[PDB]
Design an enzyme around this catalytic site. Structure first.
Site, PDB file in Angstrom:
ATOM      1  N   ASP A  93      -0.560  -5.278   9.788  1.00  0.00           N
ATOM      2  CA  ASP A  93      -1.555  -4.346   9.278  1.00  0.00           C
ATOM      3  C   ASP A  93      -2.680  -5.287   8.855  1.00  0.00           C
ATOM      4  O   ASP A  93      -2.530  -6.064   7.908  1.00  0.00           O
ATOM      5  CB  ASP A  93      -1.029  -3.579   8.072  1.00  0.00           C
ATOM      6  CG  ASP A  93      -2.045  -2.586   7.525  1.00  0.00           C
ATOM      7  OD1 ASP A  93      -3.241  -2.706   7.850  1.00  0.00           O
ATOM      8  OD2 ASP A  93      -1.657  -1.688   6.757  1.00  0.00           O
ATOM      9  N   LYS A 138     -13.482  -1.633   5.774  1.00  0.00           N
ATOM     10  CA  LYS A 138     -14.022  -2.534   4.761  1.00  0.00           C
ATOM     11  C   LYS A 138     -15.003  -3.579   5.273  1.00  0.00           C
ATOM     12  O   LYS A 138     -16.126  -3.672   4.773  1.00  0.00           O
ATOM     13  CB  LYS A 138     -12.895  -3.265   4.018  1.00  0.00           C
ATOM     14  CG  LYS A 138     -11.978  -2.361   3.228  1.00  0.00           C
ATOM     15  CD  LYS A 138     -11.089  -1.589   4.167  1.00  0.00           C
ATOM     16  CE  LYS A 138     -10.218  -0.641   3.404  1.00  0.00           C
ATOM     17  NZ  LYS A 138     -11.032   0.245   2.532  1.00  0.00           N
ATOM     18  N   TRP A 170       0.901  -1.142   0.000  1.00  0.00           N
ATOM     19  CA  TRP A 170       0.000   0.000   0.000  1.00  0.00           C
ATOM     20  C   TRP A 170       0.953   1.207   0.000  1.00  0.00           C
ATOM     21  O   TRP A 170       1.832   1.310   0.854  1.00  0.00           O
ATOM     22  CB  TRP A 170      -0.855  -0.029   1.267  1.00  0.00           C
ATOM     23  CG  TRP A 170      -1.841   1.090   1.381  1.00  0.00           C
ATOM     24  CD1 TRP A 170      -2.702   1.526   0.417  1.00  0.00           C
ATOM     25  CD2 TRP A 170      -2.124   1.868   2.553  1.00  0.00           C
ATOM     26  NE1 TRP A 170      -3.508   2.520   0.915  1.00  0.00           N
ATOM     27  CE2 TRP A 170      -3.176   2.749   2.224  1.00  0.00           C
ATOM     28  CE3 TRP A 170      -1.593   1.902   3.852  1.00  0.00           C
ATOM     29  CZ2 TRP A 170      -3.713   3.659   3.149  1.00  0.00           C
ATOM     30  CZ3 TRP A 170      -2.126   2.807   4.769  1.00  0.00           C
ATOM     31  CH2 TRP A 170      -3.175   3.670   4.412  1.00  0.00           C
TER      32      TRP A 170
HETATM   33  C1  LIG Z   1      -2.927  -2.455   3.581  1.00  0.00           C
HETATM   34  C2  LIG Z   1      -3.913  -1.334   3.902  1.00  0.00           C
HETATM   35  N1  LIG Z   1      -3.601  -0.757   5.201  1.00  0.00           N
HETATM   36  C3  LIG Z   1      -4.297   0.291   5.813  1.00  0.00           C
HETATM   37  C4  LIG Z   1      -5.413   0.836   5.094  1.00  0.00           C
HETATM   38  C5  LIG Z   1      -6.069   1.957   5.879  1.00  0.00           C
HETATM   39  O1  LIG Z   1      -7.437   1.939   5.942  1.00  0.00           O
HETATM   40  P1  LIG Z   1      -8.368   2.993   6.696  1.00  0.00           P
HETATM   41  O2  LIG Z   1      -9.171   2.346   7.713  1.00  0.00           O
HETATM   42  O3  LIG Z   1      -9.097   3.610   5.545  1.00  0.00           O
HETATM   43  O4  LIG Z   1      -7.461   4.040   7.371  1.00  0.00           O
HETATM   44  C6  LIG Z   1      -5.894   0.375   3.740  1.00  0.00           C
HETATM   45  C7  LIG Z   1      -7.119   0.994   2.998  1.00  0.00           C
HETATM   46  N2  LIG Z   1      -6.996   0.814   1.421  1.00  0.00           N
HETATM   47  C8  LIG Z   1      -7.929   1.226   0.359  1.00  0.00           C
HETATM   48  C9  LIG Z   1      -9.012   0.126   0.234  1.00  0.00           C
HETATM   49  C10 LIG Z   1      -8.579   2.603   0.759  1.00  0.00           C
HETATM   50  C11 LIG Z   1      -8.070   3.909   0.178  1.00  0.00           C
HETATM   51  C12 LIG Z   1      -6.715   4.246   0.713  1.00  0.00           C
HETATM   52  O5  LIG Z   1      -5.738   4.129  -0.077  1.00  0.00           O
HETATM   53  O6  LIG Z   1      -6.638   4.617   1.907  1.00  0.00           O
HETATM   54  C13 LIG Z   1      -7.127   1.250  -0.995  1.00  0.00           C
HETATM   55  O7  LIG Z   1      -7.656   1.749  -2.005  1.00  0.00           O
HETATM   56  O8  LIG Z   1      -5.971   0.747  -0.986  1.00  0.00           O
HETATM   57  C14 LIG Z   1      -5.088  -0.734   3.181  1.00  0.00           C
HETATM   58  O9  LIG Z   1      -5.292  -1.330   2.001  1.00  0.00           O
END
Ligand SMILES: Cc1ncc(COP(=O)(O)O)c(CN[C@@](C)(CCC(=O)O)C(=O)O)c1O
Ligand SMILES: Cc1ncc(COP(=O)(O)O)c(CN[C@@](C)(CCC(=O)O)C(=O)O)c1O
Lengths: 396, 396
Positions: A211, A246, A130
């Site tokens: 994570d 999610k 990420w």
């Molecule tokens: C590995 C990973 N870690 C931490 C997070 C943090 O999530 P939070 O609860 O929103 O703070 C996300 C969200 N990833 C997305 C699904 C959301 C958009 C983003 O980039 O934050 C994604 O598109 O990867 C991850 O994919």
């Protein structure tokens, strides 16, 4: 003073969303941000969540500040989900949990905590990973190194290269692991591989940082937690940043948790007081609503059953779309084999398209995906699948 | 790795909350945390807020991510409240606002934004001031400096000492000002004094940072912004961290805002891009529930009218307790003049009590106040006034 500031580039992920909301041509397809969508292409609020929210609207009598670490029951329910109801970690009170603003927030408090209270100087993250991971740790002044992870040829986990690249990770170094549904590859280690890493981790003296943003999207709640639990039974200390964005569809309410695990109760409580100090100097205390919803659902047996069913449905619709995606690509005339897509876990699949093709799909066919070639399979629907695959084939 | 972490000391404010919650005395009195209470001693949810939450529950269709800077309307409504419906800063598009998790969050992002993108080295804070100010800025790596402010003898603002103290603040330095209802003194500068400071600020070359956590608790919405509007009409650049925790009674929902002001529209947007980057590496995007409630109330006139009346009632009840408090103290035998309390603005009152006395009030009488002698007048009710004053007179 603001003249000397150099502009910042757009977020490789969140940016895309603005570029999409701007596109005017009809038929545009958004396969960027990792947000779930149902068959009609919308991101609805779960039923179990609407219910919990109605309960709160009727029973909340005050908005008085929560403690620095948030709702108590929230922390307890989190620990059971991660370690298991009868876990010894819980029974020995070796774990403390702080409610945070999203998984990102959990990652940041952990980073701030580590930078200010330990001798940790380096965090090892997988390549690829990420994008925001490096930004969060650098934000606390921590150096970030990368380890090998993906075999782009066999579309599998390059376990040999992973082991070799982590040879330089010293005792005291933090090693970041994705609990399940690796972002963006969708390739997770097998239980055997996890066990191997757990052993290696203890021998090398690494501080494991998990994570966990997609628990329940791979196989199931308990199954997706096996890797973490292999480490937990092996280690004295570890940190876990989890997110409910999610699996509860609570993206914008910012619900997450940072769980600290130490050798014993006395040590963790001492260390946790410093974590709270870090939270206090950041946002003071956590937003109530999102976390209240989750604690309510996890606590109520009737509500929890509904939620678990809704999670199952989302997981299955995604796997369903995975198979349909591969079938339609063939149907539409793809000569490249995309079968590997069926073996990936979670919302994201590494398509294997070049940054060139990704840009061609967008500016030419109106299809949006992240420049790394990551596509959100949860964004695919029976209605956009055909136009989507027709676009991909044309750029192959 | 966690074995040698030293325990952190309890927060001087939030800490007391736990002590109070634990105390077994049935007649305990909480005058610590700055939270409003109605005549019954409860911290209710405003009616305007409850109605707005009902709208949300009924009309929300998704919890999809907000966007780094949050709800647009929210941003527009707080700028009008801060600068005025037809402000030049608004028309000339010189201001950008990011929705943040509480005022504390707004302060941290501003701090991170400054430390990572400018040359700023230290921040100037009033002496005394909200204890957390130093922690937030030191965490972002900024040096903190204190300037004179309160005349403990005449219980007034020492303008001479304030101006002389600030003459040591170099250009490029940041100077923090409380918009109104100074915490903990309750003594604010007159417009004239604000006029001067604003002029002295531009000439001295400081970067003004306003903490506006009590707009509406001094004299009124528009009136309480005067000081800020004075600097706004004079400076090219400034930052304002505001909070909706108190004037909306949304403490635990974490609703705040960080507003950036630059010389022109091009410079602010360029600078704001780095602020969004600072946010992305912190908590990614803001919690929607609280901010949404504020936006819909400020946007709906029928709802707006209700809220404004509720805020007025809160301001007036506090004023009535302030008078009642001074009158009761003399009646219970106070061997001193506490008239100066009537001149203080906001929720607090800098009593003048020593730490040993404050300490005695808690343990001997179960009356909880901050060790600095700060007392929450908004926590006083007709029912606890007598016991409360008797306790104070006894330690005098
Ligand atoms: C590995 C990973 N870690 C931490 C997070 C943090 O999530 P939070 O609860 O929103 O703070 C996300 C969200 N990833 C997305 C699904 C959301 C958009 C983003 O980039 O934050 C994604 O598109 O990867 C991850 O994919
Ligand atoms: C000057 C000041 N600035 C910023 C804040 C931050 O507010 P937020 O929106 O909750 O993050 C507070 C809250 N002050 C209390 C009323 C609350 C307790 C605390 O210390 O945060 C107080 O008792 O001072 C302030 O008094």
């Amino acid at each position: 003073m603001f003249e000397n500031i150099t502009a910042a580039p757009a977020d490789p992920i969140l940016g895309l969303a603005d570029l999409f909301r701007a596109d005017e041509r009809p038929g545009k397809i958004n396969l960027g941000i990792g947000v779930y969508k149902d068959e009609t292409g919308k991101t609805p609020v779960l039923t179990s969540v609407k219910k919990a929210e109605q309960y709160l609207l009727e029973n909340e009598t005050t908005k008085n500040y929560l403690g620095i670490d948030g709702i108590p029951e929230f922390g307890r329910c989190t620990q059971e989900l991660l370690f298991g109801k009868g876990s010894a970690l819980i029974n020995d009170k070796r774990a403390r949990t702080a409610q945070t603003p999203g998984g990102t927030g959990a990652l940041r408090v952990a980073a701030d905590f580590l930078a200010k209270n330990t001798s940790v100087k380096r965090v090892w993250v997988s390549n690829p990973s990420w994008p925001n991971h490096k930004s969060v740790f650098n934000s606390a002044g921590l150096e970030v190194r990368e380890y090998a992870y993906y075999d782009a040829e066999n579309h599998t986990l390059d376990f040999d290269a992973l082991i070799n690249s982590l040879n330089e990770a010293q005792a005291g170094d933090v090693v970041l692991f994705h609990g399940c549904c690796h972002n963006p590859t969708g390739i997770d280690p097998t239980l055997e591989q996890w066990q191997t890493l757990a052993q290696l981790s203890v021998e090398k003296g690494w501080l494991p940082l998990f994570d966990f943003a997609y628990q329940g999207f791979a196989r199931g709640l308990e199954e997706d937690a096996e890797g973490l639990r292999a480490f937990a039974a092996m280690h004295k200390e570890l940190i876990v940043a989890s997110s409910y964005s999610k699996n509860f569809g609570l993206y914008n309410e910012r619900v997450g948790a940072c769980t600290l695990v130490a050798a014993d109760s006395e040590t963790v409580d001492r260390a946790f007081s410093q974590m709270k100090a870090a939270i206090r100097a950041n946002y003071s205390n956590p937003p109530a609503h999102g976390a209240s919803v989750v604690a309510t659902i996890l606590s109520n047996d009737a509500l929890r059953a509904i939620w678990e069913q809704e999670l199952t449905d989302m997981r299955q619709r995604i796997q369903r779309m995975r198979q349909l995606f591969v079938n339609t690509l063939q149907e539409k005339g793809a000569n490249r084999d995309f079968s590997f897509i069926i073996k990936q876990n979670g919302m994201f699949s590494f398509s294997g398209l070049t940054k060139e093709q990704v840009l061609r799909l967008r500016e030419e066919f109106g299809v949006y995906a992240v420049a790394s070639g990551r596509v959100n399979v949860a964004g695919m629907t029976p209605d956009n699948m055909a136009p989507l695959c027709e676009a991909i084939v044309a750029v192959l």
